Amino acid sequence: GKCRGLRTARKLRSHRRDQKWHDKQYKKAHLGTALKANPFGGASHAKGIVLEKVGVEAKQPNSAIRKCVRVQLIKNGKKITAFVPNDGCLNFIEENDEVLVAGFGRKGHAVGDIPGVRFKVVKVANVSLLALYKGKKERPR
Amino acid sequence: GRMHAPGKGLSQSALPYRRSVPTWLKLTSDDVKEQIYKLAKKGLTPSQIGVILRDSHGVAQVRFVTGNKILRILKSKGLAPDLPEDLYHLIKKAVAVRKHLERNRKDKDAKFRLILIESRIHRLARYYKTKRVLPPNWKYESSTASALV
Amino acid sequence: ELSRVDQRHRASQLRKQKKEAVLAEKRQ
Amino acid sequence: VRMNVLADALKSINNAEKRGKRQVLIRPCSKVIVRFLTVMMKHGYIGEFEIIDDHRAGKIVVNLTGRLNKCGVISPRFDVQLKDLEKWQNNLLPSRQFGFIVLTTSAGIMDHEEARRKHTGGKILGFFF
RNA sequence: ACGGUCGAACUUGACUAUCUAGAGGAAGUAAAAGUCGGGUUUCCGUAGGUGAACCUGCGGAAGGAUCAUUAACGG
RNA sequence: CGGGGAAUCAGGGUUCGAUUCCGGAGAGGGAGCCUGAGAAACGGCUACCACAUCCAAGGAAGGCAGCAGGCGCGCAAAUUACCCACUCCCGACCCGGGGAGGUAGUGACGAAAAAUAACAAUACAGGACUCUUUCGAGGCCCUGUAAUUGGAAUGAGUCCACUUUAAAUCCUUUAACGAGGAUCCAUUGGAGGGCAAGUCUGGUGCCAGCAGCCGCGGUAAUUCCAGCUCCAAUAGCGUAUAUUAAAGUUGCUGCAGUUAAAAAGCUCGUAGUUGGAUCUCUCUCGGCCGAAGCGUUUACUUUGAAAAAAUUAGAGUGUUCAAAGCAGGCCGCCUGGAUACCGCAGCUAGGAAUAAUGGAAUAGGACCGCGGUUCUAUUUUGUUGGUUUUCGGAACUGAGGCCAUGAUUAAGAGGGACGGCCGGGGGCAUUCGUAUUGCGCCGCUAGAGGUGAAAUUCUUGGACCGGCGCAAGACGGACCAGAGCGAAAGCAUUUGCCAAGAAUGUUUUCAUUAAUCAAGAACGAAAGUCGGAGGUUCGAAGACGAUCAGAUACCGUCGUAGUUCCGACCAUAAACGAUGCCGACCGGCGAUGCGGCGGCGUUAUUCCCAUGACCCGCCGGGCAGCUUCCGGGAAACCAAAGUCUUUGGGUUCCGGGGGGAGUAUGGUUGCAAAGCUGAAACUUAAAGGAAUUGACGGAAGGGCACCACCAGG
């Protein structure tokens, strides 16, 4: 049982911080290795250069080829696979162009069918995928 | 609950509610004190003096008859020894276990109980150092142990 | 990275490299 | 070992209140225990009692009515200022209409409403309802 | 100009830490349909058996499905 | 960088604070200085280092983390504009100057207000009031479709002017123009569930795609792509990320640890934390009062004064309302510009419960007086030089009186005595028992061994069997139990020694000495490792024999280390009650082990007395059990796993979805094996726990049938 005395504030705060280190979110936030392993470097978005297009197979009960691209981030050079969302949207991307990439949703976790993909593309050649898909703007090269 | 045992005994004395000297005890406080003096001259602990007075002379409680307890009467007269009774017996027990362990080398039970008796000695000496009955530099040593007894 | 002076030295090195590349591409 | 003899007393009183007994024997006794039971008596909660004097710490025989729901000690005796008494009587008491934080102050042992009247603070001992 | 002082910075070794070029080494991946083709109840610790698995030795657990019998005991 | 503060929030809390107010720091990096009231100043100087500018090649000049601007960097951020009019600052100064600051520009960071219609008549449509048996009949409102009409009312815009201002812009005030739906046209996300809103129509056909999560799509898709329609918020609405609440999933309030994640093998022990009853204001100086001590000291509580402004709360006040602001109101006056909060520490003055602590026990203890020794009185010896003025004050002391002279009690706290016992508790020595194995001799025979079958093996140089002995090493059965002892691991042949130990008994003694424990220590099955000794049995490795489409484990014979001892290491177990320790309370019962008490009887061949063995009851600590709707719990179950949202007795270790993994790496310990401490990247939507039904059983028993069989045609 818990110590409950009047002069036990040191034991209580010491025990709380040691046992705080056993939480998954607390350790991911405060130990410093998750921020050094994060490709985005703790940023909401990052810009990169497309290296390859790649077709990634959906996890077992779904059967599809999810269209992704392999990008290399500008600021650190780390390599990323990023999903291109809507249908036909892969045809807007060519090789070696700037791509703005955001998170997919689950803060570093794979989302849905796509295995190992944490990222989705947001912009190509500084026009959004949404305006390109709905035909609101055109991309230069 | 014992301090170093898993047992929980209830064996102990129960004083009566009557704190008065009984009528049939025809002893003054002076004669009881003098009896304590001669028993100390024979050479005994205060516990033994209390037992001898209880068994043979009808003195149910010395501090109800004289108004003081036995070791205080001894200390005021000057017949109390320098180290206390319980501590002296603890040291004597530890000395006996030490002698037995110098005899027998493979006895681990004796080594365990020896550790327990040393711990009792240290706790009692710590208490008597606080109360200034022992000198502050008093210490129990493994080697100079039988010199005290 | 460790050792704050070392990671600041690493950053200064990388700044020098990239800035040398920029000064290369701007003379042409 | 035994610490907090008030805790022992209040626990034995509660455990006989749940079983619905008519009298409780609490041993050992204290001045703090006697002042607590007096406060519980003056609101009609505990009922009239006896102190048995053995020449050691006494015993108390408490006659019980079926009125006490919970009798409790708060340990340690936290320092309760008058500005933080409201949070205490929100945490411990079931209603704003009844129930009592017993606290000891330099005016004596009282309940919280008397401490509001006498304008003092003290250390928390318990609560009963 | 002598001397002192404060003292940037330099040179030389050690201890480092980083950045950046690299002959070669050892891999996988995609392209070659090319060539050849029965047993265990469930465990634990330790040791051996080619690393582990698994099996055996030794000591432990149940976290493994109690039927039947039981009054005399004296001469 | 720190504070003021900010976001969130029941209460407790978590997180942020580069950033305009206060403080510090620095001008590319160091270092040194001049001047001066003030600088280690950089819109000063001197070097070095790193950059870099102009050169006629000798030399010369540098410092935007000021305002604007540029490059670079990136997910991420404005004009190379106007003015000293305001606020203020400097100077010799009513006058000069100010990228301070003010003003516009950019500006969906964010906050406030607020359009995109309103109305009437007609045509259908409901719901009401009156009259009617009802149908119905009306004058009462309401509603949209209006692929119906109609004029009224407005700003958005275009635009004179005034106003504003340093000059302007904007707002406000105002002329002229400005509205019928093909305009002056609202978006962004959704429509299976969570979660409001379609099982509509076409396309697609596990593709393309969707889908935070569960999932949808493989030819009837409520989920994709579309069309229509509906839903939500709305001048905004989606997404990514950090962070807060949800999270009682970090738990002080307030979690958990038998079986789900989880209590250390055991005990000792220091720090730390916690700790049982007990005790109801006055002598001197000054005017009944002020000064002087207070009172052992605090902790606690209440008061007071101090605690920047802005912020926050909040008073007043029609900024056209509001967010704001600090103003305003009345016919020269009247007023405002409050107040609270402001941890902790520190000053202050009351309270005295709670909690620490002290006050006399070798009495060199108080309070009075009677005295001594030494050091001192700053005035009374008119003016004096004085040996002495006296008086009075401080420190060491001799007896005396006086105090009711002075020691809370003896914890169903603990230690220590003492008493008679008790036990597979431990150590050393000693005694015995069989059996096994080997050896000797004797008897009789050809088999014996092993298996599901065999085979390997032994064996007429005589096995196996039977007898008499001898030795070696092991092991202490049955008696042996839910019996005992120990801290746990553990512990069973006799006898003797050795030292311990629980319980019980006690009108014994001490008097709080205690509980739980970081650190540190002792012991710790089996296996294993170093040295010596020994080897009977068994036996990992290993050898054979058997066994098969593919057998390399099972099985049998043999057998090494080991198994045994002595001295060292090792420190692990399903080291289990898968259940910390100490204290308290909450139902019952009779068996048992030890100790004690009370009592008829039977027994020691009727015992002569106590004593043992039994019998009946009580008490205390034990090992367990049964019974119970105590109350708990996911339940199974549990008198603890209870006394828990009516949540606080003290304290120790320890868990936080499954894996990666008790893995890597470092440290430490060990001869080694390994032990202790112990990650992350990554991966995943469930792993797990307690119950509940009974498909199918290659599970078992039965019954029936010439569309089953038997004997036949």
Query: At CA B78, angle to CA B76 and CA B83, rounded to 5?
Result: 105
**CB contact set of B63 (below 8 Å; sequence gap of 6+):** B69, B70
By DSSP bridging, strand D126-128 and strand A127-128 are unpaired
Among A135, A132, A113, A112, which Cα is nearest to A121's?
A132
**CB contact set of A114 (below 8 Å; sequence gap of 6+):** A56, A58, A59, A66, A68, A83
Q: Are D88 and D129 in a shared domain?
A: yes
Amino acid, res. B104: N
User: C8 — phi, psi (to 5°)?
Assistant: -70, -35
Q: Are B90 and B45 in a shared domain?
A: no
* D54 in B contact zone (CB under 8 Å): yes
Using DSSP, state whether A116 is helix, strand or coil: coil
Considering the domain boundaries, does residue B19 fall inside one? no
Q: Are D40 and D7 in a shared domain?
A: yes
Among B10, B32, B7, B12, which Cα is nearest to B21's?
B32
Q: Taking CB atoms and an 8 Å cutoff, what residues of chain A touch D3?
A: none
CA distance linking residue A46 with residue A76, whole number of Å = 10
| Residue A88: CB less than 7 A from any atom in strand F | yes
Q: Number of structural domains, chain D?
A: 2
The 3-class SS string of B22-80 reads: CCCCCCCHHHHHHHHHHHHHHCCCHHHHHHHHHHHHCCCCHHHHCCCCHHHHHHHHCCC
| Residue A130: CB less than 7 A from any atom in strand F | yes
Q: Which domain holds residue B130?
A: 81-149
Q: Report whether A101 contacts A45 (CB < 8 A).
A: yes
Q: Are D32 and D63 in a shared domain?
A: yes
**Tokens, residue D3:** 């610490």
CA distance linking residue B107 with residue C27, whole number of Å = 92
Which of B64, B80, B96 is at the close of a domain? B80
Among D31, D64, D24, D30, which Cα is nearest to D47's?
D64
**Tokens, residue D45:** 């909660």
Q: Taking CB atoms and an 8 Å cutoff, what residues of chain D touch A6?
A: 76-78
Q: Report whether D16 contacts D49 (CB < 8 A).
A: no
Q: What share of chain D is helix, strand, coil (3-state, %, to 5)?
A: 30, 25, 45
Considering the domain boundaries, does residue B86 fall inside one? yes
How was this structure determined? It was done by cryo-EM
Which of B62, B80, B98 is at the close of a domain? B80
* B15 in D contact zone (CB under 8 Å): yes
Residue for token pair 């050649």: A125
Q: Are B111 and B52 in a shared domain?
A: no
Contact B19 D54 (CB under 8 A): no
Which of D34, D68, D102 is at the close of a domain? D68
Bases of chain E below 7 A from a protein C-beta are 17-20
What torsion do the CA atoms of B38, B40, B46, B48 make, to the nearest 10 degrees?
-70
D23 CA to E62 C1' in angstroms comes to: 48
Which of D40, D68, D96 is at the close of a domain? D68
Q: Are B87 and B74 in a shared domain?
A: no
Q: Are B88 and B58 in a shared domain?
A: no
Among B133, B20, B15, which Cα is nearest to B67's?
B20
Q: Are D10 and D22 in a shared domain?
A: yes
Q: Are D39 and D85 in a shared domain?
A: no
Which of D68, D91, D116 is at the close of a domain? D68
Cα distance between the two ends of chain D = 29
Residue A64: alpha-carbon gap to chain centroid:
21
CA distance linking residue B79 with residue B46, whole number of Å = 10
Chain A's closest residue to D77, CA to CA, is A6
Nearest nucleotide (C1') to alpha carbon of C2: E17
> Exposed, middle or buried: residue A44 (CB in 10 Å: 0-12, 13-18, 19+)?
exposed
Amino acid, res. D30: S
Q: Are B93 and B147 in a shared domain?
A: yes
Other CB atoms within 10 Å distance of the CB of residue B28:
12
Considering the domain boundaries, does residue B87 fall inside one? yes
Instruction: Could you list the beta-strand ranges (E) of D6-116.
Output: 23-26, 49-52, 59-63, 71-73, 79-80, 102-105, 108-111
Considering the domain boundaries, does residue B55 fall inside one? yes
Nearest nucleotide (C1') to alpha carbon of C16: E19
**CB contact set of A127 (below 8 Å; sequence gap of 6+):** A137, A138, A139
User: B135 — phi, psi (to 5°)?
Assistant: -65, 150
Q: Taking CB atoms and an 8 Å cutoff, what residues of chain D touch A4?
A: 75-76
Q: Number of structural domains, chain B?
A: 2
Q: Are D36 and D92 in a shared domain?
A: no
> Exposed, middle or buried: residue A138 (CB in 10 Å: 0-12, 13-18, 19+)?
exposed
A75 CA to F274 C1' in angstroms comes to: 58
Contact B15 D55 (CB under 8 A): yes
Q: Taking CB atoms and an 8 Å cutoff, what residues of chain B touch D1?
A: 1
Q: Are B114 and B69 in a shared domain?
A: no
Q: Are B104 and B140 in a shared domain?
A: yes
Q: Which domain holds residue D86?
A: 69-129
Considering the domain boundaries, does residue B14 fall inside one? no
Q: Are D64 and D76 in a shared domain?
A: no
Q: Are B85 and B70 in a shared domain?
A: no
Q: Are D62 and D1 in a shared domain?
A: yes
CA distance linking residue A72 with residue A81, whole number of Å = 9
